[PDB]
């Protein structure tokens, strides 16, 4: 029972950490998407201005 | 969204001051001075043209940019006049930030104070910046800067700490637009992943319940005088100017002018209007927004067709704008009616005006066009 | 606000329940000695204990190990009681640290207190608290009371939530009420994360408000 | 899992927006070249006149 | 242009 409980607590901490890491990765990916979409919008706006 | 809201009856007219094409590349960032009579001009050429209304207007040999500094490099497409901070923040493609006291060249011909505050922001988290606004309260100097890549944070112009950060709106993703409450109440972020996001200014509470589901780009923000819970925004496509109830998180306001049907899934009209300016008067909000269609927009809600706007296209009969009431809101449909082309010939984005019973306005295009309307 | 000198009154307060559960049941230490089974928690639906609380000015004792009266916690440790410690208000007010323990049988031959923590009588800025200050538990260990207290009880995500709640409830919120509701709703999620957090022992310490300004009065030593 | 589905959708959107960004950049380059060509043609016509 |  204690082995199971220790494994469970460790895995719960690991799952919380994995969720936080996924959140950070998603924030970075949203930043990259922001950069790419801003590039697309600026390029379209420049083509239109030209 | 303007000091001393004017009386009703605002209409535009055909007067101007000066025009410029100095910016070698596209200009998509300008700052208007508050204490003084000057505005800043920056171009995608990584160079910034400083223009003083008092000098640039005329009665002088040449109306050249007073402060032209390119030491920033890259493309300068981010500028702001710090609120009572005696500093000007500039941003360029190369993930770098500057806050210079270029005012040092006011009286004599002397080098402008290079960025008193500068930083090269993370290339991945923040790049240089996508947004940057400074908050002034006399006691403290806090400026808030956003990056295209989802990330929002503020930087105190008189403090070294930079803990004022807003967790990246990952679902929002792209971060290229934000709205500001007039009393530091809350902020909304214009994005393009379809979804939209809102932020608080008291506790900076993230509130992500807004969206335009089609994954549409939204880079325009003003505080909707109609409702403190309502804001004014502009999105690309269909010449859209809508007001969104962020509680529902969708835009409920229209001046419908687009091949696309209202909230059309395909948005048959890709044209739009941006650079909106807000002020309460004449029974509803009074706005001047840069019409990507090159339509110099003096926009009206109660009688949009009745009023007068600064746009061109003289071939159109008396202004045509539709006024409706649709499912608890009043809906508007905008309908259309040798020589040299006076109007801008590029994608106009920026507008700035000053007056007291009379004055002037500033206009620009997506390549460096300068239009200083009177 | 008040100066501490005038009162010099003895210590008294109310009783509250400790958040830390008895998951500290020394599974191997239980595997060693037969006494521990005699633990009140070990044999009851919940755990009562013999309370011990004292105040020391940076480690110098200034009161007695106050113990509460006979009350029931072997089925629910919900503490609704009062206690009067033996420390005068001015007594060693400077650097005073509230240290305490609860005596419950670590065994038939091991009935004593093994839970302790130390926190300053006043706050981190000097203001005294006559309101509940839930304490950080140091299970299988008792309080020390020294200025370098080894078991901090009172002075981050949960920290951010608490500080923001305190600021808002102080009257620091704008006429936009909608946030306060959402404020509490999201504080709910933050507390849910904190509770999902495990391997920690805690206790709710309810400092009794004083009928002098009739509040959790903030007293400063002088 | 819900947030991850949303993030995967947003990431596919990011990839599409980046492809469109490259396309729009090439198109803006072509448009600027055309604008420069028009300006040069105006230059030549003005010189002749 | 160049405004000299």
Numbering used by the authors:
A (entry chain D): 201 to 250
B (entry chain A): 970 to 1306, 1322 to 1358
C (entry chain B): 9 to 163, 170 to 236
D (entry chain C): 149 to 197
E (entry chain C): 395 to 398
Which of the paper's sentences describe this entry?
The Unc-51-like kinase protein kinase complex (ULK1C) is the most upstream and central player in the initiation of macroautophagy in mammals. All forms of canonical autophagy, bulk and selective, are initiated upon the recruitment and activation of the FIP200 protein and the class III phosphatidylinositol 3-OH kinase complex I (PI3KC3-C1). While ULK1C and PI3KC3-C1 are both critical for autophagy initiation and recruited at the earliest stages, beyond the presence of ULK1 phosphorylation sites on PI3KC3-C1 subunits, it has been unclear how their activities are coordinated.
Two-dimensional (2D) classes of the ULK1C:PI3KC3-C1 supercomplex were visualized, in which the distinctive C-shaped density of the ULK1C core and the V-shaped density of PI3KC3-C1 were both clearly observed. Further 3D reconstruction resulted in an EM map containing the crescent FIP200 dimer and all four subunits (VPS34, VPS15, BECN1 and ATG14) of PI3KC3-C1. The peripheral regions, including the FIP200 molecule binding with ULK1MIT:ATG13MIM and VPS34HELCAT (helical and catalytic domains), were not modeled because of their high mobility. Two main interfaces were identified between FIP200 and PI3KC3-C1. The first interface is formed between the FIP200(166–181, 473–485) and BECN1BH3, a well-studied Bcl-2/Bcl-XL-binding region that regulates autophagy and apoptosis. A zinc-finger motif, composed of BECN1C137, C140 and ATG14C43, C46, is located behind the BH3 domain and supports the conformation. The BECN1–ATG14 zinc-finger and the BECN1 BH3 region were not visualized in previous PI3KC3-C1 structures; thus, it appears that the presence of the FIP200 proximal arm induces their ordering. The second interface is formed by the globular ULD domain of FIP200 and the curved HSD domain of VPS15. The VPS15HSD adjoins FIP200 sites 1 and 2, forming a large pocket with the FIP200 proximal arm and ULD.
